[PDB]
Amino acid sequence: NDGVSETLLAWRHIDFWTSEHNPDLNATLSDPCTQNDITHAEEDLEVSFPNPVKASFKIHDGQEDTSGLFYGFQLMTLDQVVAMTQAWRNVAKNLNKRSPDQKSIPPNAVQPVYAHPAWIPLITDNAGNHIGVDLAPGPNGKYAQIITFGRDFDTKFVIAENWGEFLLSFANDLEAGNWYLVDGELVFRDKKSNGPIQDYFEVLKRRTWIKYQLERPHRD
Amino acid sequence: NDGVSETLLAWRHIDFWTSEHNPDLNATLSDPCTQNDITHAEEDLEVSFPNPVKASFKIHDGQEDLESMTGTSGLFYGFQLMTLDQVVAMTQAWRNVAKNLNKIPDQKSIPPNAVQPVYAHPAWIPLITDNAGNHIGVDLAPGPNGKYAQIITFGRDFDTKFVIAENWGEFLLSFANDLEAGNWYLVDGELVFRDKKSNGPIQDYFEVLKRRTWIKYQL
């Protein structure tokens, strides 16, 4: 299915978890987008948002203040999504005029380019990098797979099959105790290994890398 | 807009032209598809056809001619307009080729970066064939300087891929414009392309479309 269930489930887990373990962060989570907010953004960008993503917006329109929900990375508002998508679209146009190896993991899952108009950012680094939804996949890719892209992602990672599965995998990390407070700033650590603090992109990259490797033995 | 008006207009001219100049070719133009044909096609492939492609199917479901022996005479200067059944079938075939090639010379695109540099993509929907594994169809996963639902060349001999139209409507209309402009000889006969205004030789239509694309890019 599309992944709407996983979006609704994950947002309840996350809505809960913030009010309990970090009230200050709960407060940053915005009111729902209206259907017209979404329609206008879809019109401005000339694209259909996937169902789980539209579902996510009708629960929270990003974060407002605003230190980031996803272990420091900020959930983007719909206006930020539009402003940033156009920003990346300008980059892609200038790369046409003037035309580090761009790669993908899995190979051929994501287009090997610095910028693509159909890559819609949903989370931000506040430093040029994003998690977002890929509406123009490679040949071994899947439509509306979730990817990392930006300044420092010459290699691009497919981190989930849809927005719902991503939001859920994050909700699972919170429920599994893989977190530390610096109340204050939220950062990742693997609890079962008593491990150090880690940057969340590096965790998502490793897990993509791992999942690819474990799946490689299978074909038919 | 989506190109729907151009598809209706083009099909009007192509319907009229064929009847006047080659009734036998007009007869191959199959009956319309109904919504239930295309919805079943879409749910089967897990893909949403663009508007002008659906409008074109709601006017003609490809060509047939089951009494030919020699084979169907292709509307597009020898190339056959696929039936919706063939479209579904061929898409799945090309998806297996894509699955089978998951780790072919150098793959390239005109205009550069408009089409993905790959042999097969699951989202290239073939709409026209030469029955030699070459196709015209619609691109639903464009490259970074491409447009969604642009019309492209792909297949066995298309190591370089060409964006020949912005949408299915503009493509059909430009085919229709070649017919009105007198750019054809007949061999009722087999339809082949020639440039009348300059008394040009007989040319393969893919080569004509490739020339035009190349010229349009550098301009």
From Swiss-Prot, chain A:
GO annotation (BP), single: regulation of fungal-type cell wall biogenesis
Superkingdom field: Eukaryota
Keyword Transport set for record: no
Any one annotated GO CC term: mating projection tip
Subcellular location: Nucleus
An MF annotation (GO) of this entry: DNA binding
UniProt entry keywords in alphabetical sequence: Cell wall biogenesis/degradation, DNA-binding, Isopeptide bond, Nucleus, Phosphoprotein, Transcription, Transcription regulation, Ubl conjugation
Annotated function: Protein involved in the regulation of cell wall assembly and 1,3-beta-glucan synthesis, possibly through the transcriptional regulation of cell wall glucan and chitin synthesis.
Self-association state and partner proteins as the record states: Interacts with TYS1.
Family: Belongs to the KNR4/SMI1 family.
Record's miscellaneous remark: Present with 5680 molecules/cell in log phase SD medium.
Protein name: Cell wall assembly regulator SMI1
Provenance organism: Saccharomyces cerevisiae (strain ATCC 204508 / S288c) (Baker's yeast)
Organism classification: Eukaryota, Fungi, Dikarya, Ascomycota, Saccharomycotina
Residues of the full protein shown: 84 to 340 of 505
